[PDB]
Design an enzyme around this catalytic site. Structure first.
Site, mmCIF file in Angstrom:
data_model
loop_
_atom_site.group_PDB
_atom_site.id
_atom_site.type_symbol
_atom_site.label_atom_id
_atom_site.label_comp_id
_atom_site.label_asym_id
_atom_site.label_seq_id
_atom_site.Cartn_x
_atom_site.Cartn_y
_atom_site.Cartn_z
ATOM 1 N N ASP A 29 18.376 -18.227 19.690
ATOM 2 C CA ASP A 29 17.194 -18.645 20.454
ATOM 3 C C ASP A 29 16.046 -17.647 20.275
ATOM 4 O OD1 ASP A 29 15.825 -20.472 21.987
ATOM 5 O OD2 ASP A 29 16.540 -19.682 23.908
ATOM 6 N N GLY A 88 12.323 -21.098 36.920
ATOM 7 C CA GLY A 88 12.655 -22.289 36.160
ATOM 8 C C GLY A 88 14.072 -22.729 36.460
ATOM 9 N N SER A 89 14.554 -23.688 35.660
ATOM 10 C CA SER A 89 15.913 -24.206 35.831
ATOM 11 C C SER A 89 16.950 -23.089 35.776
ATOM 12 C CB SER A 89 16.207 -25.263 34.767
ATOM 13 O OG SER A 89 16.067 -24.735 33.454
ATOM 14 N N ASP A 95 17.204 -12.364 26.500
ATOM 15 C CA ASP A 95 17.787 -13.690 26.745
ATOM 16 C C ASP A 95 18.929 -13.973 25.758
ATOM 17 O OD1 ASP A 95 18.377 -16.134 27.812
ATOM 18 O OD2 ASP A 95 16.514 -17.136 27.254
ATOM 19 N N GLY A 101 16.593 -20.330 37.066
ATOM 20 C CA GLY A 101 16.529 -19.664 38.350
ATOM 21 C C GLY A 101 15.196 -18.978 38.555
ATOM 22 N N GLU A 102 15.227 -17.709 38.958
ATOM 23 C CA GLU A 102 14.010 -16.966 39.248
ATOM 24 C C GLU A 102 14.146 -15.533 38.754
ATOM 25 O OE1 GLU A 102 12.349 -17.790 43.374
ATOM 26 O OE2 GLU A 102 14.182 -18.979 43.574
HETATM 27 C C1 LIG Z 1 15.755 -10.555 34.125
HETATM 28 C C2 LIG Z 1 16.372 -10.673 32.751
HETATM 29 C C3 LIG Z 1 17.764 -10.835 32.579
HETATM 30 C C4 LIG Z 1 18.337 -10.954 31.303
HETATM 31 C C5 LIG Z 1 17.523 -10.909 30.168
HETATM 32 O O1 LIG Z 1 18.026 -11.009 28.892
HETATM 33 C C6 LIG Z 1 16.141 -10.746 30.280
HETATM 34 C C7 LIG Z 1 15.279 -10.703 29.069
HETATM 35 C C8 LIG Z 1 15.590 -10.626 31.571
HETATM 36 N N1 LIG Z 1 14.165 -10.490 31.717
HETATM 37 C C9 LIG Z 1 13.403 -9.268 31.772
HETATM 38 N N2 LIG Z 1 14.012 -8.007 31.679
HETATM 39 C C10 LIG Z 1 12.021 -9.600 31.924
HETATM 40 C C11 LIG Z 1 10.919 -8.604 32.030
HETATM 41 N N3 LIG Z 1 9.581 -9.016 32.180
HETATM 42 O O2 LIG Z 1 11.137 -7.385 32.013
HETATM 43 C C12 LIG Z 1 11.929 -11.057 31.964
HETATM 44 N N4 LIG Z 1 10.908 -11.900 32.084
HETATM 45 C C13 LIG Z 1 11.161 -13.284 32.080
HETATM 46 C C14 LIG Z 1 10.090 -14.232 32.224
HETATM 47 BR BR1 LIG Z 1 8.279 -13.578 32.403
HETATM 48 C C15 LIG Z 1 10.245 -15.613 32.234
HETATM 49 C C16 LIG Z 1 11.574 -16.124 32.100
HETATM 50 C C17 LIG Z 1 12.632 -15.240 31.972
HETATM 51 C C18 LIG Z 1 12.462 -13.807 31.956
HETATM 52 N N5 LIG Z 1 13.541 -12.930 31.830
HETATM 53 C C19 LIG Z 1 13.292 -11.596 31.828
#
Ligand SMILES: Cc1ccc(O)c(C)c1-n1c(N)c(C(N)=O)c2nc3c(Br)cccc3nc21
Length: 270
Positions: A147, A33-34, A165, A36-37
């Site tokens: 959030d 998404g916006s 997040d 990133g990935e």
């Molecule tokens: C990568 C990351 C960095 C910081 C943070 O606070 C979090 C919660 C994560 N993070 C996980 N550790 C996810 C997981 N599955 O373990 C996970 N899945 C996601 C999906 Br699906 C969609 C959009 C964002 C996501 N961010 C994620």
């Protein structure tokens, strides 16, 4: 050159490949998404599976960089709590920020779409409990998530969920916008406190327990913020759950319940 990021091994520096492409194997792209990935990866130095988020585009200016890097600082303040996604390491390269966190399961948003119905109250209570535990941890240290919603709660084994997040997190004592569907009414007048998260978790639980699409705005947005729940969807709700929900959706933040208080309630004890 890659540099670590903090507010407190396959290196191959010569090789013309990024540290991300050199220290990890991209097993899957969990999401994009916006922001990133997000990729599912296994450490090429520890073998353990981890989740990595990367920004889409390079840093535009000094501000964009600082705003993005703040999540690292916020994540650090949360620390290590059983119901909070833990960050292992964070770094930057090519104007791109990388956060490496514990690999969690599917989001509560995804789980609910797959189930395509009101979740069983047994699962609901547990998510409410663990998320309340997480919030209490944040609230004790003067932190507000801002959030809290299905997409930011990640499920784990044996019906446990962790909060994640921490980008919009603010330390009580600069604020970004959150989803209006889950925002406490006091925020409209600029009143920001731990109470706001509790109200968001209330609407979160209401959404998953009644399969109700929260309103972005209009009269429906107001009805949910007047202390009276809609009887049409809250019919199947047990008497106990409804009472807990009324406590969390209390319009006045001064009178709204706190996480520790809710957690102390018998229904939500262990
Ligand atoms: C990568 C990351 C960095 C910081 C943070 O606070 C979090 C919660 C994560 N993070 C996980 N550790 C996810 C997981 N599955 O373990 C996970 N899945 C996601 C999906 Br699906 C969609 C959009 C964002 C996501 N961010 C994620």
């Amino acid at each position: 050159q890659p540099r670590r990021v903090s507010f407190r091994p396959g290196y191959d520096p010569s090789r013309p490949e990024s540290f991300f492409q050199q220290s990890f194997q991209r097993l899957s792209r969990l999401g994009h998404g916006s922001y990133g990935e997000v990729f599912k990866v296994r450490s090429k130095e520890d073998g353990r599976l981890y989740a990595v988020k990367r920004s889409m585009s390079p840093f535009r200016g000094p501000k964009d960089r600082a705003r993005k890097l703040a999540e690292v600082g916020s994540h650090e303040k949360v620390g290590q709590h059983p119901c909070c996604v833990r960050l292992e390491q964070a770094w930057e390269e090519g104007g791109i920020l990388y956060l490496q966190t514990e690999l969690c399961g599917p989001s509560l948003q995804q789980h609910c779409e797959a189930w395509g119905a009101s979740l069983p109250e047994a699962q609901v209570w547990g998510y409410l409990r663990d998320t309340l535990l997480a919030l209490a941890h944040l609230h004790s240290q003067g932190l507000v998530h801002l959030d809290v919603k299905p997409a930011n709660i990640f499920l784990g084994p044996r019906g446990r969920c962790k909060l994640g997040d921490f980008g919009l997190l603010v330390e009580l004592g600069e604020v970004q916008e959150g989803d209006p569907r889950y925002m406490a009414p006091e925020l409209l007048q600029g009143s920001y406190g731990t109470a706001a998260d509790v109200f968001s978790l209330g609407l979160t639980i209401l959404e998953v327990a009644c399969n109700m699409e929260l309103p972005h705005g209009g009269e429906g947005w107001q009805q949910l913020r007047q202390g009276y729940l809609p009887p049409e969807f809250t019919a199947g709700l047990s008497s106990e759950l409804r009472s807990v929900l009324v406590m969390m959706l209390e319009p006045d933040p001064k009178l709204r319940a706190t996480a520790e208080a809710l957690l102390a309630l018998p229904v939500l004890r262990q």
